[PDB]
Amino acid sequence: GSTAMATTMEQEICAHSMTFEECPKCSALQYRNGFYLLKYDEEWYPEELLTDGEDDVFDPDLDMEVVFETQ
Ligand SMILES: [Zn+2]
């Protein structure tokens, strides 16, 4: 159920930040979300193919301030 086992875990795990129940909301909010949705990318094939787990995207340092939604 929604990737997770019907959100039994309850540890707020998602591509963005929230639970799998709120995963569609999270996906809608940022769109990129570790390039979970392939369709988002212009070339279709994104740099990060893998579904974001725990801060998988932007692993190398980009900005000093760590904000999940950073462009
Ligand atoms: Zn997500």
Pick from 34, 38, 4: nearest CA to 19:
4
Q: How far, in Å, from the CA of 59 to the mean position of ligand 1?
A: 17
Cβ atoms of 26 and 15 within 8 Å: the answer is yes
Q: Tell me how the structure was determined.
A: NMR
Cβ atoms of residues 1 and 19 within 8 Å: no
Quick check: helix, strand or coil at residue 39?
A: helix
d(CA 36, CA 50): 7
41 is in an annotated binding site: no
> Which residues keep their CB under 5 angstroms from ion ligand 1?
14-16, 23, 26-27
CB atoms within 10 A of CB 20: 21
47 is in an annotated binding site: no
- Going along the chain, which residue ranges are E strands? none
User: What residue numbers bound the domain in which 10 lies?
Assistant: 1-71
- CA distance from start to end of the chain: 31
